[PDB]
A paper describes a structure:
HIV fusion is facilitated by the viral envelope glycoprotein (Env), a trimer of non-covalently linked heterodimers (gp120 and gp41) (Harrison, 2015; Lee et al., 2016). Binding of the receptor CD4 to gp120 triggers a series of conformational changes, including opening of the trimer, exposure of the co-receptor binding sites, and rearrangements of the gp41 helices (Blumenthal et al., 2012; Harrison, 2015; Ozorowski et al., 2017). The N-terminal region of gp41 forms the fusion peptide (FP), which becomes sequestered during the initial steps of receptor binding by moving toward the trimer interior (Ozorowski et al., 2017). Here, we identified a pocket in gp41 of our previous cryo-EM reconstruction of an early pre-fusion intermediate Env (CD4 bound and co-receptor mimic antibody bound) (Ozorowski et al., 2017) that is proximal to the FP and contains a bound detergent molecule used during cryo-EM grid preparation.
DSF analysis showed that lauryl maltose neopentyl glycol (LMNG) did not have a major effect on protein stability and has twice the mass of DDM, making it unlikely to fit into the binding pocket. As a control, we solved a ∼3.7-Å cryo-EM structure of CD4- and 17b-bound B41 SOSIP frozen in the presence of LMNG. We did not see any additional density in the FP pocket that could account for detergent, and the FP itself was less ordered, similar to that of the partially bound pocket in the DDM reconstruction, supporting our hypothesis that the presence of ligands affects the local stability of the FP.
Author numbering:
A (entry chain H): 1 to 52, 52A, 53 to 82, 82A, 82B, 82C, 83 to 100, 100A, ...
B (entry chain B): 519 to 548, 564 to 661
C (entry chain A): 49 to 126, 196 to 308, 325 to 359, 361 to 395, 397 to 405, 408 to 505
D (entry chain L): 1 to 95, 95A, 95B, 96 to 106
E (entry chain C): 1 to 97
């Protein structure tokens, strides 16, 4: 039930980096895992990566491993995605999605792949 | 070859007597891995016992005791090592207790044994 | 100091962790080991300084690292964090007894005195090549599937009065503890499955505690014995920890330790006639590692039935300071680590070597 | 590696009819599928969880099943609000790798 | 001994060390020998002191031979002599609030 909220739009020169984020609210941050999705025009729901908040661990799609960092700020319930070496190929609407992991705080984390609480999507372009 | 393990707990005197008795009687004539892994280990244990024995029998030559189990010396007791009498130590103590009583003097004694052996060998060769 | 080798009755075909490990780690056990009983031999056995413990510890860690691979393993390094990710297959996991054996030239002394509490002279000593097999069980608070004392419950504390050391009392009777999962109960929380229940005979527990307090009273003759739960700390200590298969269980032992015996009587159990002390248990995915400092995550639970059947064979009890107490001593079950668990099993054995060359004065003279 | 091949993505179906959608894997997948309903300008909401479980707040109309490398979705008594782009996603790999689908549209 | 003074509800890092970087068991005790904090293998345990809700330790430094007692939200009542038991040696620090 996290009312995950999207950030603003961005435009960067190619070769630059962009950092975007989503704020989770209404529940404990640590009990939700988050992933990032890139809805590039004409594409499907491309997965960027995943972050575990109980264990500060992240996993990335192979083509983005040298380009993407996913992090989190446990005190501001904020999910972050940092993408470097930007290309026009990366023009897309970016967003977070949460997964509930009941009792993760106590060590009962499941690490599920079901994305239920979605942000709204922010467009990132290059120029 | 340490058939003397069963002597543990007996006194030094008793151990000596037991060996003499045994010596007279002896001299006078009076599922596969479970088999082969251990077969090798038992042979290794026995071959090693022989090798250590032979090694020591020759190492003892440095004190003039080569080839012997018991060898007598030309070095007296200094009584600083221990001031007990012969009967007290041989009759009221086991070998382990005895060793503990003097285990800080063994290097001193070993050194003296080497030295007197050298001098004795020298004396004979000078006389010849 | 030498390195002992292991032996076990490995089957090597069920693809179980201990049999797979043993297949290459250990040799077959000795089908006909000998034992020599020594006569008037007294030997000092110090269980707290027995190096066999460290060797057992290293072999167990290798077994665990080669088997129960976490999905995520976190190792702090000083102070960054190194994360290791591995495939997370589940494995069958059931301990096999492992024997330790002396290499050629060495032998193991065994203390056969049934009343020996350790840290001192054992008056009954025999020699063997191999120890009996020991089951490498990893657990806290209540140790499981160990050996039993021949006649009486034995306190083996390094120092009864130190308060920074454990009691590690072993029992002369095992108490069965049966832990089961509520099979086919599948329920999920939303914005359960991970549950188990452990049943302890209350009669056995009552008898066991009455006997334990009698021994504690002998050590503390003018005081009441009261039991409590932990004061805090990591979940592995606060609750009872054990595992079966790939499942790591945490059980709340509070129901077992809230008594106060003084006149060897507590009425802690109201003669409840339930006959069962039951513990609430949970199965966790993220646990603290026992293998030095670090944390690890395992894959979620098996969908079918999980059962554990264990023998409580001892308690890693501790005691409070006592400095500010008046007529009462407080004991708590929370405690233990793996070295303590092995000390309670390895206390009977010591490895020595014979040095055949000795000196004594006598009446003979060498002719020169 | 693991790839997801979907139906033609031009499914011509009238409202009130039962639409059939599909999700083929290049590699075996367990019941680790997620089916989503994307509307223009909207979040790609999850409707089916674990190949077959209603994800919550999901009409009975929308259901499916499958195993191995062949999974399906059907939408009974299809409503006009259901003419969305559907996605099938797979999370069965570990270390995580997500097959995120392609996207199929119902048409009329 | 070492003496460290803090104020009101702030936090203090009291320390014990070892030359042996092997996460060797140690304990912290107060002046009445009441266990406060200590190590049991890899796990942290606490004693029944007034500090169980305040005390912690830098677990990551245990294999560096550093075994601190960190107390947050100090109470005036916490002023005491704190005792380090590390290996065989003992060390002391006085805490004033
Ligand atoms: C103290 O000693 C006792 C024994 O002396 C130890 O108790 C044993 O603990 C093991 C723990 O698993 C238990 O083993 C099970 O026995 C069952 C008997 O039929 C087996 O069926 C079962 O195998 C299944 O479960 C395993 C769990 O990891 C799987 O790995 C295995 O592949 C099997 O899994 C299949 O079946 C399950 C059924 O629900 C299904 O869900 C799976 O998907 C799969 O289909 C285990 O072998 C022993 O029976 C116990 N012994 C006794 C007498 O009960 C005890 O643990 C020791 N104490 C400690 C603390 O270690
Ligand atoms: C040391 O204890 C052992 C263990 O009890 C004694 O030896 C055993 O005594 C029982 C008594 O019924 C026999 O059945 C066993 O066969 C004996 N075992 C062996 C290996 O002999 C032993 O005698 C005791 N020794 C001393 C010195 O008291
Ligand atoms: C066993 O525990 C007792 C009590 O805790 C230890 O006794 C203390 O030893 C220190 C050493 O200097 C003394 O200062 C204390 O006054 C002693 N306590 C009491 C109550 O007298 C004893 O030393 C411990 N045994 C060992 C071997 O450490
Ligand atoms: C542990 O003991 C409890 C005692 O209550 C068992 O619970 C009972 O199980 C029977 C089985 O049919 C039920 O009819 C009772 O109603 C249960 N009692 C209560 C209070 O719910 C429990 O099942 C035992 N554990 C195991 C593993 O059998
Ligand atoms: C744990 O499970 C075992 C096996 O089901 C129980 O063992 C039975 O205990 C009764 C008690 O008298 C015996 O009569 C049975 O013969 C035992 N069964 C077997 C196969 O031996 C055991 O009691 C259970 N433990 C607890 C604590 O309830
Ligand atoms: C073990 O279970 C008991 C319940 O049986 C828990 O203790 C309860 O904690 C609540 C919290 O306010 C109290 O109100 C209850 O009175 C407590 N009950 C008892 C029997 O003390 C206990 O905390 C659990 N312990 C662990 C380690 O999980
Ligand atoms: C178990 O230990 C706790 C301490 O952790 C005891 O609880 C304290 O009891 C005194 C009695 O007046 C209270 O003033 C304290 O505030 C209590 N402390 C806490 C943290 O609750 C508890 O009574 C002990 N139980 C037994 C059976 O001895
Ligand atoms: C210790 O805790 C246990 C449970 O947490 C208490 O035992 C149960 O108390 C209820 C109270 O109605 C009884 O119905 C149960 O039958 C009791 N269990 C058993 C096995 O009899 C226990 O009384 C507490 N003891 C103390 C001294 O506080
Ligand atoms: C104490 O707990 C044990 C847990 O096994 C109970 O034993 C079970 O009782 C149910 C009752 O129908 C039987 O169906 C189970 O087969 C029993 N289990 C075993 C392993 O035999 C035991 O009855 C409980 N004690 C009491 C008095 O209820
Ligand atoms: C028994 O335990 C006590 C604990 O202090 C110890 O002093 C005593 O020596 C132990 N028994 C033997 C034979 O040493
Ligand atoms: C334990 O069982 C005995 C059996 O007679 C009983 O007298 C005693 O009261 C029971 N429990 C306690 C805690 O004393
Ligand atoms: C508990 O001890 C008894 C004693 O014979 C034994 O039969 C039983 O198998 C033991 N249980 C376990 C789990 O080892």
């Amino acid at each position: 039930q996290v009312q995950l909220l999207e950030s603003g739009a961005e435009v960067k020169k190619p070769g630059s980096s962009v950092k975007v984020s989503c704020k989770a609210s209404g529940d404990t941050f640590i009990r939700y895992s988050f992933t990032w999705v890139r809805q590039a025009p004409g594409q499907g729901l491309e997965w960027m990566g995943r972050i575990i908040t109980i264990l500060d661990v992240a996993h990335y799609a192979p083509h983005l491993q040298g380009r993407v960092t996913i992090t989190a700020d446990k005190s501001t319930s904020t999910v972050y995605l940092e993408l470097r070496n930007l290309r026009s190929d990366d023009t897309a609407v970016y967003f977070c999605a949460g997964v509930y992991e009941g009792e993760a705080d106590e060590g009962e984390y499941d690490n599920n792949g079901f994305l239920k609480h979605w942000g709204q999507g922010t467009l990132v372009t290059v120029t | 070859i340490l058939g003397f393990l069963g002597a543990a707990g007996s006194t030094m005197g008793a151990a000596s007597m037991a060996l003499t008795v045994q010596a007279r009687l002896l001299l006078s004539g009076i599922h596969m891995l479970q088999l082969t892994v251990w077969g090798i280990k038992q042979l290794q244990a026995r071959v090693l016992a022989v090798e250590r024995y032979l090694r020591d029998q020759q190492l003892l030559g440095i004190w003039g005791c080569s080839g012997k189990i018991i060898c007598c010396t030309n070095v007296p007791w200094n009584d600083s090592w221990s001031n007990k009498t012969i009967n007290e130590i041989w009759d009221n103590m086991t070998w382990m207790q005895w060793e503990k009583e003097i285990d800080n003097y063994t290097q001193h004694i070993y050194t003296l044994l080497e030295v007197s052996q050298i001098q004795q060998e020298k004396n004979e060769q000078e006389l010849l | 100091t030498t390195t002992l080798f292991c032996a076990s009755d490995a089957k090597a075909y069920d693809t179980e962790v201990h049999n797979v490990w043993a297949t290459h780690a250990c040799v077959p056990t000795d089908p006909n080991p000998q034992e020599i009983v020594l006569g008037n031999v007294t030997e000092n056995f110090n269980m707290w300084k027995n190096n066999m413990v460290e060797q057992m510890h290293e072999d167990i860690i290798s077994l665990w690292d080669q088997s129960l691979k976490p999905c995520v393993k976190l190792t702090p390094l000083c102070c960054n964090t190194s994360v290791i990710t591995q495939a997370c297959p589940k494995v069958s996991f059931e301990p096999i007894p492992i024997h330790y054996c002396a290499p050629a030239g060495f032998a193991i002394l065994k203390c056969n005195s049934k009343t020996f509490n350790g840290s001192g002279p054992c008056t009954n000593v025999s020699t063997v090549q191999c120890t009996h097999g020991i089951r490498p069980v990893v657990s806290t608070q209540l140790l499981l599937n160990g050996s039993l004392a021949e006649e009486e419950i034995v306190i083996r504390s390094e120092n009864i009065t130190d308060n920074a050391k454990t009691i590690i009392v072993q029992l002369n009777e095992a108490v069965e503890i049966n832990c089961t999962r509520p099979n086919n109960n599948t329920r999920k929380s939303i914005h359960n499955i991970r549950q188990a229940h452990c049943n302890i005979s209350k009669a056995r527990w009552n008898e066991t505690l009455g006997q334990i307090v009698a021994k504690l009273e002998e050590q503390f003759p003018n005081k009441t014995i009261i039991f409590n739960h932990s004061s805090g700390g990591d979940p592995e200590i606060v609750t009872h920890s054990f595992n079966c298969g790939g499942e790591f269980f945490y059980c709340n032992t509070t129901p077992l330790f809230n008594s106060t015996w003084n006149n060897t009587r507590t009425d802690d159990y109201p003669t409840g006639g339930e006959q069962n002390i039951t513990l609430q248990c949970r199965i966790k995915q993220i646990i603290n590692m026992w293998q030095g400092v670090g944390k690890a995550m395992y894959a979620p639970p098996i969908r079918g039935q999980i059962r554990c059947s264990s023998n409580i064979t001892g308690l890693l009890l501790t005691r409070d300071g006592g400095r500010d107490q008046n007529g009462t001593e407080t004991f708590r079950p929370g405690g233990g680590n793996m070295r303590d668990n092995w000390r309670s099993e390895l206390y009977k054995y010591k490895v020595v070597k014979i040095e055949p060359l000795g000196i004594a004065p006598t009446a003979c003279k060498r002719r020169v | 590696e693991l790839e997801l091949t979907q139906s033609p993505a031009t499914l011509s179906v009238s409202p009130g009819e039962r639409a059939t959608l599909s999700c083929r894997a290049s590699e075996s997948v367990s019941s680790d599928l997620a089916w989503y309903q994307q509307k223009p300008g909207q979040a790609p909401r999850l409707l089916i969880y674990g190949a077959s479980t209603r994800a919550t707040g999901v009409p009975a109309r929308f259901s499916g099943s499958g195993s191995g490398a062949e999974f399906t979705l059907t939408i009974s008594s299809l409503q006009s609000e259901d003419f969305a782009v559907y996605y099938c996603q797979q999370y069965n790999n570990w270390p995580p790798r997500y097959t995120f689908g392609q996207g199929t549209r119902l048409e009329i | 001994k070492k003496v460290v003074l803090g104020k009101k509800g702030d936090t203090v890092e009291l320390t014990c060390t070892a030359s042996q970087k092997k996460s060797i068991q140690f304990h912290w005790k107060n002046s009445n020998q009441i266990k406060i904090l200590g190590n049991q293998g890899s796990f942290l345990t606490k004693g029944p002191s007034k500090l169980n809700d305040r005390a912690d330790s830098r677990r990551s430094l245990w294999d560096q031979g550093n075994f601190p007692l960190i107390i947050k939200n100090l109470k005036i009542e916490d002023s005491d002599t704190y005792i380090c038991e590390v290996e065989d040696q003992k060390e002391e620090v006085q805490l004033l609030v």
